[PDB]
Amino acid sequence: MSDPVELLKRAEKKGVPSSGFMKLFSGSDSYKFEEAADLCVQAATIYRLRKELNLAGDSFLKAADYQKKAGNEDEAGNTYVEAYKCFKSGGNSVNAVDSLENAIQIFTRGANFKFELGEILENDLHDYAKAIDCYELAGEWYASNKCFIKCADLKALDGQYIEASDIYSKLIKSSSLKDYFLKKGLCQLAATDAVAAARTLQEGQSEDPNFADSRESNFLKSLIDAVNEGDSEQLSEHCKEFDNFMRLDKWKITILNKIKESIQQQEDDLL
Amino acid sequence: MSDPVELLKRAEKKGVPSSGFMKLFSGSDSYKFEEAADLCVQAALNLAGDSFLKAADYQKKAGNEDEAGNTYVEAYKCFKSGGNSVNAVDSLENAIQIFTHRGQFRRGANFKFELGEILENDLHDYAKAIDCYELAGEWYAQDQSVALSNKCFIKCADLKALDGQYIEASDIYSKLIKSSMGNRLSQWSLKDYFLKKGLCQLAATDAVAAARTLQEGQSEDPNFADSRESNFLKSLIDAVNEGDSEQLSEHCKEFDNFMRLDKWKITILNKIKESIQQQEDDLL
Amino acid sequence: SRTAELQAEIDDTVGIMRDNINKVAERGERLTSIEDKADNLAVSAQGFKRGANRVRKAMW
Amino acid sequence: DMTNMDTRTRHLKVSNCPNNSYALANVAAVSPNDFPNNIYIIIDNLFVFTTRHSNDIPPGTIGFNGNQRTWGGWSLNQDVQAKAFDLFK
Amino acid sequence: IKFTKQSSVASTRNTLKMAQDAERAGMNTLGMLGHQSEQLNNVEGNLDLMKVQNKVADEKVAELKKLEMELEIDRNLDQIQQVSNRLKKMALTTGKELDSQQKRLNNIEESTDDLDINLHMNTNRLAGI
């Protein structure tokens, strides 16, 4: 097998654009860039065969840059996708994010890779704001419900309860519903807007017969009543009762924890 | 319609590489191989598969590896279709090699899973099926397809446990448990996983490991703690601890009465009961 | 009466799920064919790209 | 005579007992290269057993029976720490 | 009587556990179906784009050629009824997506089928130029 380092060196040698007098006699530089990209792809496939995923990703990136210089944008995007794949497999989240960004720009597929980028940001890099932006954009282009679920979840976890409730309303209108209503109300209750939570509960009960008789509706009504009476212990009891039959998730845990701390803050305002 | 035999003869005539003096005046042989492959594709269930195979070989000689892999996939399709499992296996092997050499490990894994299915059901080559399933699961994991890797690992662990490799099957079950933990989508799979793992550890006479697995499942997964599978595993562990084969049989019947047992579990518990009998032999 | 009503609802849901199993079998069938045809499409698209490139070079 | 013996710690894998006779003797079967013969060895600073030379156990491995594992709560292939022991001191 | 009541309690406990079994499986099925429906939406978009590009290719190629026990029983039945309501809705729900995706898949198959040939058509024509 050819040495990947030698192939990369040859690609770099061929990747130099024609300059000065030579440009008057040398044809289009596109062919040189294409040959350099092919050499980089060969070296990079060799790296992948050797499980050197990061070097293979770097070589795909060089090949994609050469393809861009050659005008073959679609091939550049495919090579960027391969770079993202091997970087992600190699544990290099930053280079995978960069490759996904270039591929998304070239394609704009953009939504699929934007959703993947948001997943990478949320799980690997914990960049929750960028993940929210990616999910929102991916949902908009898809329009979307899944991306909006992810976006609303992250936004509610990020302190943006009103925007999360708005996204939940969009999800409800597009459509999951039984939970949506609940989640929306929870967000409106995290924002201390008990009236909005009651309005959401009434809308869900009147619009969706399934939600009216659903445990989510009763739990939301109990939470609204507890916040109205300012009985944190009653809210905790209702949460335990709801957990006993339907297990709660970390999202709901956080929302209700912030709600209870808001009741405590009201107790602070009581003084 | 053209005669497929005549087309194959023409492809063979065109498929002869240029030799000697003619090579100095004849262009690249790739075009001749391409024409022969096209003729073979036209002429080409078993005969059609053989002709796809010839076309794929000519395409390989022409350098068109992707087309060769596609033709090999068609050959596999028809060999399996003709009841010719061996030629289908061969075609899948060539297609998998072509795809893996081209970086399409996804395709390689898909066709490796299909090859393992063929080996397990059609040829009963259980060792090769286990190898194929393990490799397919590994490649799927490298692609982060958690569910496909999980399916491949389920198949691999099932065959390994049926094959006498209880420890390896339990290890694969542990991997499945770790991969499926925290997912609301695979929980029952987990509920069964734990059970199966414990069963394997009990087939290996490692009751302590089975108890550790039961405790881990109970403490880690609330659903498994209250599941009948947890109670059944605890009952089996207790029965093996007391060496009461009849009690184990009673527990098995009770478990069957509410949740039907499968042939995998049947085999595991049969080997376990025979191990109790072997202990009774060691008792003398 | 409550238990009989529950039994009736469960029987109805079993019927609906049996229907769904038949439908998902039909969906798998639609999907095995579509995967194979999308493979055909990919091969043909690559072949078209290559042929067009060869004509581009010819005309040049 | 326990006056002189190598007290260096060793990490040994728990494996199935070689046979019923060794399990009956309740003596840790070790290779000659592992430790001297007929000396008391402690494991995890809690479990004391008498060593006996055994050629069927490769060096670096320690054999246990089911009851010993139950006492220590150990599984097969588990790694345990072994050192020389001196009860008199 | 006591033994029978105990048996009824155990039966309802298992029925509840299994009902919960059905519910998780059904929720996963719906989640996966939403994701797969969406992948198929992506497929649909590319098929549309390729149709437009094949129109362009058609015209370019053409020009190129031209150029207590009682209470527990009650509570367990309560919960089984609750889960059962959700299971029924899920069965109905899964059926609707299978219907919709089935028609979408039929159209995807036909559109993919066509494009495949349109590409073969233009490839054969280009071969002769």
Coordinates of C-alpha atoms in Angstrom, one line a residue, chain E residues 15-87:
Chain E
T15 CA -51.7 -7.9 33.8
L16 CA -50.6 -4.4 34.8
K17 CA -47.0 -5.2 34.2
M18 CA -47.8 -6.5 30.8
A19 CA -50.0 -3.5 30.0
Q20 CA -47.0 -1.3 30.8
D21 CA -45.0 -3.7 28.5
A22 CA -47.3 -2.9 25.7
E23 CA -47.2 0.8 26.4
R24 CA -43.5 1.3 26.2
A25 CA -43.2 -0.9 23.1
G26 CA -45.9 1.2 21.4
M27 CA -44.4 4.5 22.3
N28 CA -41.1 3.4 20.9
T29 CA -42.8 2.2 17.7
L30 CA -44.4 5.6 17.3
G31 CA -41.1 7.4 17.9
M32 CA -39.3 5.3 15.4
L33 CA -42.1 5.7 12.9
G34 CA -41.9 9.5 13.2
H35 CA -38.2 9.4 12.6
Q36 CA -38.5 7.0 9.6
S37 CA -41.4 9.0 8.2
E38 CA -39.1 12.0 8.3
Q39 CA -36.2 10.1 6.7
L40 CA -38.7 9.3 3.9
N41 CA -39.6 13.0 3.7
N42 CA -36.0 13.7 3.0
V43 CA -36.1 11.0 0.3
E44 CA -39.1 12.7 -1.2
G45 CA -37.4 16.0 -1.5
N46 CA -34.4 14.5 -3.3
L47 CA -36.6 12.6 -5.7
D48 CA -38.3 16.0 -6.5
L49 CA -35.0 17.7 -7.0
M50 CA -33.7 14.9 -9.2
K51 CA -36.9 15.1 -11.3
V52 CA -36.1 18.8 -12.0
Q53 CA -32.5 18.0 -12.7
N54 CA -33.5 15.2 -15.1
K55 CA -35.7 17.7 -17.0
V56 CA -32.6 19.9 -17.4
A57 CA -30.6 16.9 -18.4
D58 CA -33.2 15.9 -21.0
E59 CA -32.9 19.2 -22.7
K60 CA -29.1 19.4 -22.5
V61 CA -28.7 15.9 -23.9
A62 CA -31.2 16.6 -26.7
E63 CA -29.2 19.7 -27.7
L64 CA -25.9 17.8 -27.5
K65 CA -27.3 15.2 -29.9
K66 CA -28.5 18.0 -32.2
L67 CA -24.9 19.5 -32.2
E68 CA -56.6 -5.3 51.4
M69 CA -56.8 -7.8 48.5
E70 CA -60.1 -6.4 47.3
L71 CA -58.7 -2.9 47.4
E72 CA -55.6 -3.8 45.5
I73 CA -57.6 -5.7 42.9
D74 CA -59.6 -2.5 42.4
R75 CA -56.6 -0.3 42.2
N76 CA -54.7 -2.6 39.8
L77 CA -57.8 -2.7 37.6
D78 CA -57.9 1.1 37.7
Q79 CA -54.3 1.2 36.4
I80 CA -54.9 -1.5 33.8
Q81 CA -57.8 0.5 32.5
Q82 CA -55.6 3.7 32.4
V83 CA -52.9 1.9 30.4
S84 CA -55.4 0.1 28.2
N85 CA -56.9 3.4 27.2
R86 CA -53.5 4.5 26.1
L87 CA -52.8 1.2 24.4

